[PDB]
Amino acid sequence: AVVPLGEVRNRLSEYVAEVELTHERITITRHGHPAAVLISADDLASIEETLEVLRTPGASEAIREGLADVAAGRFVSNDEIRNRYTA
Amino acid sequence: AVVPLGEVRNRLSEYVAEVELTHERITITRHGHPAAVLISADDLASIEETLEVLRTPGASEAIREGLADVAAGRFVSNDEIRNRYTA
Amino acid sequence: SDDHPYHVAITATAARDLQRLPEKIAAACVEFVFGPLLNNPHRLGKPLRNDLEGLHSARRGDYRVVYAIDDGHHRVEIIHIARRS
Amino acid sequence: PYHVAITATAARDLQRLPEKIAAACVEFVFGPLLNNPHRLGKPLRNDLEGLHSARRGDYRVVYAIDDGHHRVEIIHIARRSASY
Ligand SMILES: [Cl-]
């Protein structure tokens, strides 16, 4: 939603709860302009975690590979993995 | 900064301005529990565009090569670039 | 895990990742993946955005686990394990 | 308005691109971007702090703004739609 400052101001408690439970962003407007945004803490941290993933050197190309494994059901043995690591 | 909801409600304009001027994030806490984040629109837009760059194949290494060009002053002629793609 | 308990499914890609890591780091990741992660896949990670929507990522120690919560197959699909820095 | 400096990388980017996008990109770079570079683009974060990215059409323009010499350094030009 796009809500003017004073209206956000009057129902801040209500907008924060809505942002909390729907992850809808509230663009707070000042002078017909987008100044700040109410965003869910989970919403922001998932943007940031996506950034951390995407800046990892090989990550986007490997993820594409693992998704193709999923499509093929090319999964390895759990009991073999567990034996091989974890002492 | 971490701020309870009532104090945000009181000086929200000051908090929005502050968030706008620096790019500080206010973590809003309702009843002793984090709920939402006040972030600058330009700040949010800045991390969403960075996502777009990092998602683009080869962008990360191409940018390093371009920075290296700047470091060496390895620039091309503007007149030639216009020529090859204008009229 | 109860009633329709989930299980781990490790792609070839992620096993290759585990093999590429130092044995130490690989061990803790496997411990994390089959215990904490399998039990709270929604809580111990964050959903990803943009090209990566549908996926999650959980952070711990020197590693990042990128996974999918496949509810139709009652699976935690391990797609890629990468090193943190 | 600002001086423009086009890296060899960015020139090669233009060469790689479908001719129509390139011509549209160049027009953009020499006109509007050169007058309002702090506005048309958006600062980049994390490893890209110090850089700006602008987007329009199907092209994306990453650059640095050299205020101390009133100059725009074009670092990389990218195809917007491209993704893994
Ligand atoms: Cl196969």
Numbering used by the authors:
A (entry chain C), B (entry chain D): 2 to 88
C (entry chain A): 2 to 86
D (entry chain B): 6 to 89
What text appears in the publication on this structure?
Mycobacterium tuberculosis encodes six known TA systems with toxins belonging to the RelE-family of ribosome-dependent ribonucleases with conserved RNase T1-like folds. The RelE3(YoeB) toxin, which is mildly toxic when compared with HigB1, RelE1, or RelE2 was also shown to act as an RNase. Both RelE1 and RelE2 are acutely toxic, very similar in sequence (∼54% identity) and were proposed to have redundant functions in M. tuberculosis. In contrast, in vitro and in vivo analyses using Mycobacterium smegmatis and M. tuberculosis revealed that RelE1 is a site-specific RNase, able to cleave 16S rRNA from free 30S and formed 70S ribosomes, to release the anti-Shine–Dalgarno region and prevent translation. We show that in sharp contrast with established RelE toxins, the RelE1 RNase toxin of M. tuberculosis does not cleave mRNA during translation but instead specifically targets the small ribosomal subunit, cleaving the exposed 3′ end region of the 16S rRNA between C1517 and A1518, just upstream of the anti-SD region.
Furthermore, we solved the crystal structure of the RelE1–RelB1 complex at 2.20 Å resolution and showed that it forms a heterotetrameric complex in which the RelB1 antitoxin likely displaces the C-terminal α-helix of the partner RelE1 toxin, and identified key residues of the catalytic region that are essential for its activity. The asymmetric unit contained a heterotetrameric RelB12RelE12 protein complex. RelB12RelE12 forms a triangular (or inverted V-shaped) complex with the RelE1 toxin molecules positioned away from each other. Each RelE1 protomer, RelE1 and RelE1′, forms the expected RNase T1-like fold, and the C-terminal region of neither toxin was resolved in the structure. The RelB1 antitoxins dimerize through respective domains comprised of an N-terminal three-stranded β-sheet and the α1 helix, which then extends and wraps around cognate RelE1 toxins using helices α2, α3, and α4. Interface analysis using PISA identified salt bridges between RelE1 R50 and RelB1 D44, and RelE1 R65 and RelB1 E50, alongside RelE1 hydrophobic patches corresponding to hydrophobic faces of RelB1 α2, α3 and α4 helices, generating complementary interacting surfaces. The N-terminal dimerization domain and α2 helix of RelB1 are highly conserved, whilst α3 and α4 amino acids are not conserved. The RelE1 surface residues juxtaposed with RelB1 helix α2 are also highly conserved, but not those surface residues binding RelB1 helices α3 and α4. Helix α3 of the free RelE toxin therefore appears to be displaced by helix α3 of the cognate RelB antitoxin when forming the complex, such that antitoxicity likely operates both through sequestration and deactivation of the toxin by conformational changes. While R50A, S58A, R61A had no, or little impact, the R60A, R65A, R85A, and Y89A substitutions significantly affected RelE1 toxicity, thus highlighting R60, R65, R85, and Y89 as key catalytic residues of RelE1.
